[PDB]
Symmetry: D2
Subunit: 302 residues, 4 copies
């Protein structure tokens, strides 16, 4: 019944919303959290992830992974990477095991029922895949936040997570594992408005205060009217996939240097005649989604 997951992330404000949902909903069994460099350097995203788990009292092990992409000169986005909420001094620590080894070991010892949920650059995932290719058949599915079939964000062609490590993305998208891609085309619709925030503030508790603190800072909500929560859609998809419309496509990652480096090339119309390798997100029911967020928020209320 519960879907077992390993959440790989680079917190990151909206990774934090993903952690919050994943750690609470009865439909999800969050086994571990693995951290990768992305939004910021690994030292920072690690601290950010540990801070979220400490504040929400989430008792799930957190593992540090790759501090660099597998080949390219490292890029970050844009002080911490998660300003807004107030955190107390960090007393919680990472596990000693490197995230790549933890991913490999856990998959190898499993009964093949674990789903990987990458919502940062794909560096940890790619290194685990090439270090121990025996994990490939043990992965049930990969539900990732990344890419765009239309316009990207960091460049016109590329979405940040893919652009941060295109060669790692190429590994994942050529793995043969069942893939689900929550790309910008879908995530940009899942718009957090002042009403959504007010709604979570009212529910309250640790999860409600955190969501609000993150999004009030991020959307500058004293002023003009909202913006997206990308990574959390992956969690939503696992809780109820009927809330998200997908389309099966053949997707290829462009690792050419030049104007399409890190692009996800999606064969929308099927002109290449190749078998589809990815379920690509098209539209989301935002009424359903926000209801789910509030639900997860309420799960933390003592």
């Amino acid at each position: 019944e519960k879907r077992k997951i390993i959440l790989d992330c680079d917190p990151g404000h909206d990774d934090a919303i993903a952690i919050m949902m994943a750690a609470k909903h009865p439909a999800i069994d969050l086994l571990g959290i693995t951290i990768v460099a992305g939004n910021q350097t690994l030292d920072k995203t690690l601290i950010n992830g540990l801070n979220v788990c400490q504040k929400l009292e989430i008792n799930v092990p957190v593992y540090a992974g790759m501090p660099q992409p597998i080949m390219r000169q490292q890029i970050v986005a844009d002080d911490t990477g998660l300003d807004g909420p107030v955190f107390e001094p960090l007393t919680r620590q990472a596990e000693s095991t490197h995230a790549v080894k933890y991913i490999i070991d856990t998959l190898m010892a499993s009964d093949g029922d674990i789903t990987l949920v990458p919502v940062g650059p794909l560096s940890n995932i790619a290194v685990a895949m090439r270090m121990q290719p025996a994990i490939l058949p043990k992965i049930r599915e990969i539900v990732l936040m990344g890419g765009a079939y239309g316009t990207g964000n960091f460049t016109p062609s590329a979405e940040f997570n893919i652009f941060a490590d295109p060669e790692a993305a190429r590994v994942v998208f050529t793995s043969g594992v069942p893939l689900v891609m929550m790309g910008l085309d879908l995530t940009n619709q899942t718009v957090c408005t002042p009403d959504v925030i007010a709604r979570m503030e009212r529910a309250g508790g640790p999860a409600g205060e955190l969501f609000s603190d993150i999004m009030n800072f991020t959307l500058k909500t004293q002023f003009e009217a909202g913006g997206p929560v990308h990574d959390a859609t992956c969690i939503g998809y696992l809780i109820n996939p009927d809330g998200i419309k997908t389309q099966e496509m053949y997707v290829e990652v462009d690792v050419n240097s030049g104007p399409c480096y890190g692009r996800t090339v999606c064969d929308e119309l099927g002109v290449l005649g190749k078998p589809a390798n990815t379920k690509v997100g098209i539209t989301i029911d935002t009424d359903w989604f926000w209801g789910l967020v509030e639900e997860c928020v309420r799960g933390y209320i003592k």
Copy 2:
């Protein structure tokens, strides 16, 4: 009147473009130049001459490039058939191409002009690129280039690329780096011009040589455009360029910095359009976003009726 040189690879929608351009009082069609594309040049030349002969259009037609400037040639026979213009049946051809090569004609006409001519390429950009590199003095003489090509979203021939650009990406790179004012009627706009059966019946009602030819031509691309790209009618892509020159207020554009990707691989021939301006580069193209199809079909009927005798 806007003076134009119409460069094309007829081609079903090319033929609609010719028909409009040759008739509307707002356009001064100086010449038609033919390039290889939808089919080989021998065929696109015959196709262009056949259209002009049937509609009694007395404009000179020049043969240009039979191959792209660098890549291995591809054709769009899956859409436009074996002849490149399946559907209508024409009388034996009495008229012929001029002796001057289209590239030389383009160069000479621009160089002798007062800088008021617009180029309207609706096939691969081979003729345009060769003319540009053979005589770079034409660049400041070109008022504007209004082209059918590219896509800021999904392509047709590949997921990344629209046929005209894919057929000669290096030529496209030349045009898009020329510094001349560019308007791009890409798939994102042109796909909105699907010509369904009721639209065909409209033009048959109008009648005359141009209504009959419109019907003969667009009935063929109904099946092909549906089977290949899932379209509810054969869009009429190339004619939107003529529409734009007649009244640009019918079409919404957005200024963007556009780059042509000439990398071999999954985005060869892609028009990369900076929709959101993330690169901080000055825009070099007016990119088509939406078209008022009520206005546009009215315009097509207007032009069709011009041929009633």
Copy 3:
């Protein structure tokens, strides 16, 4: 006699090529076509006309492409410093070099050889503008490329680097190709004693040779003239048949001629690649041509 069209971007050593081509009884120089390369076309044209005027070479000269077919133009640096020319009175023909190349090949009996010793822009455009010329070309003997180290970059020789897309056209044409690359041409080092010898021979061509090579010492190579040597007597130059591909990737090998020396790709050879030259034979030939100009 081998009929040729000499396509060039003069250019100090292009000038030596013109001098040999226009005089030797084994060569029938039909026309000279000019391309941008060493310098912009305005300058290479003037340079070519200047050489023909001084040597009294009565061959028509045609202006061709002022830019490469796709890339941003590069030059190497008048583009022919050394000799002093009188005021220029010779003019280009009105016909564009690309049209002249097309027309001359189409009206020929298939016995003409193209000799490109600059960027390949004129050749590529003529090939794509009228593909019917392809079977009419007997051979193409070009100066360009390197199987080992380039000059302008580690990977690329200047003529190819100046228009890689044009080169890709020529090397995928199917026409018989001979490549005089840097690996061969760098061996043809003119020494002060080679110069002194052409000086002793004397006359206009000997003075020109001396003025050009006393300069570009500041020995050193004569690249483009090896193509003319090859046509006069191919036994002087050792070649090896290879499958050659032109890399048009942006990055560290843009414009590289990738030569399959050991045949590991299992593709049929498309190019006779120059390996070594007999410099004794070659310098003798240069002196021979110089003497053709004494009155």
Copy 4:
């Protein structure tokens, strides 16, 4: 003299085995550990091969299994040169030893981090282990004294006209190493091809005898045919052992400092080492590139090491 500490990373592999033999015996070298990577064959096979060599020569050095695949590209092997086992030729008794439990990448990281910066890495297969260690723990970069690697070519490659096998097998990994900023020495084909092991050379080592002599002959007789048929070589060069030679006495090898860039473009130069021989790019050199080797010196050294194992 002072011993140079090394970690030998390899994909045995015929010349790999010669490299192990020299490294493990010469008093100028302190062989800390051997790490194995996929390359000549799949990792299962190159691991077995490496263990077999150590067992037969009684080399008591830990061996660690590393990357079974390159970091990004579709795997290729060199079975054309090395046979189906990856080390066709010699016979080996059943294994009574095994790989250590620690993954080679973690071992490389931990050993460098705990060192005093005096260890040299010697990669003579694809660079996959080295690249993953570098990106997993960038703190190892200043700990590495030097990297002396067999790979690349400034002229003609082998596997393709442009690329040498080790680089071609993992071009992205090579790009990591060549942009690391660590002092690099490149024993490329241009130098290593000069070490063709003709029959007279093998007979010389057979004359020397003992376990390393017999094994030298059993191993190098196999690449004689394969190197001729594939590449036109007069003997199986002994590429990987030149790296060990370089560390024993660098004066036996001439190098030239160059700026080297790895081409990761798909197409005809994928995996090429582009070497700026003439310095036309105006970039600082990042590699000492091998030009020529004194083969009289080098074969003397091989015999010296071979004679080391005589009982």
